[PDB]
Scaffold this active site. Structure first.
Site, PDB file in Angstrom:
ATOM      1  CG  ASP A 199      -2.110   0.942   1.144  1.00  0.00           C
ATOM      2  OD1 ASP A 199      -2.015   1.998   0.461  1.00  0.00           O
ATOM      3  OD2 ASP A 199      -3.146   0.682   1.810  1.00  0.00           O
ATOM      4  CG  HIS A 227      -5.505   1.927  -0.604  1.00  0.00           C
ATOM      5  ND1 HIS A 227      -5.218   2.195   0.713  1.00  0.00           N
ATOM      6  CD2 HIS A 227      -6.762   2.386  -0.817  1.00  0.00           C
ATOM      7  CE1 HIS A 227      -6.238   2.827   1.268  1.00  0.00           C
ATOM      8  NE2 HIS A 227      -7.196   2.939   0.368  1.00  0.00           N
TER       9      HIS A 227
END
Length: 251
Positions: A199, A227
């Site tokens: 992420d 993410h």
């Protein structure tokens, strides 16, 4: 004992971001919910309608009211601010908490602490860069001048881009500013952090710093996702979520 699983979206998103995952968890035998939080449903008033956290999280409390047995709350990204608030007010209905690259804040700490710059391992500067204040500061909205940058940072797990049903235009700043009310009975709920190793919105450094700073144990599973793992690995994600609902205390 656990009959319901409730997936909660992050900022600027809607329930439907979880479409790849909902059928996978219903096969494991659960009733599955992915509700829009207050303000996340076109025509409901948007960001300015959200009075406070009780108001923001009401659609989940409504679901938890009618659950036959116990529920698992998963929050994604800013969604963890909601599941921690709900835990404290409905600890009699919650059997487990899943923080999916989500904001895990110690009691009395606001998500602002880890979004803003700071030390150690604090800050989400990719997000602050691409998400911008509006309405004299009471709304956040993405920087649509940089659409490809928006996609690679937030939606790169998607094979291809996602549909319009997954998003809203403006986000209330309310969840960013409310501290975690979890006390007593709620700190006994088993907690699980699902890391997203790659992420760039919420860097793995900040993910791990929030785990280390929460009082008490937090179980961890790690995924090789960025993410939005509900886009890129719904099956592995569902499996982790369901193995945890099957026995949150043990797992």
């Amino acid at each position: 004992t656990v009959t319901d699983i409730i997936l909660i979206h992050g900022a600027l998103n809607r329930g439907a971001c979880y479409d790849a995952v909902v059928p996978l968890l219903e096969a494991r035998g659960y009733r599955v919910h992915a509700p829009d939080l207050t303000g996340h449903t076109p025509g409901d008033g948007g960001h300015l309608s959200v009075v406070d956290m009780e108001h923001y999280t009401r659609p989940v409390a409504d679901i938890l009211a009618r659950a036959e047995g116990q529920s698992i709350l998963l929050g994604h990204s800013l969604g963890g601010a909601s599941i921690s608030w709900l835990a404290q007010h409905h600890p009699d209905k919650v059997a487990g908490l899943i923080y999916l690259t989500a904001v895990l804040t110690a009691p009395g700490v606001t998500p602002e602490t880890f979004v803003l710059p700071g030390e150690p391992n604090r800050g989400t500067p990719h997000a602050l860069d691409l998400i911008q204040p509006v309405d004299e500061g009471r709304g956040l909205q993405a920087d649509f001048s940089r659409l490809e940058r928006l996609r690679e940072v937030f939606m790169g797990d998607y094979p291809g881009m996602p549909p319009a049903e997954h998003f809203i235009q403006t986000q209330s700043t309310v969840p960013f500013g409310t501290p975690n009310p979890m006390e007593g009975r709620a700190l006994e709920i088993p907690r699980l952090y699902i890391e997203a190793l790659d992420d760039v919105v919420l860097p793995i450094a900040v993910q791990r710093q929030m785990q280390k700073e929460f009082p008490g144990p937090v179980a961890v599973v790690s995924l090789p996702a960025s993410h939005a793992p509900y886009y890129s690995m719904p099956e592995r994600l569902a499996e982790a979520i369901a193995d945890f609902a099957d026995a949150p205390a043990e797992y």
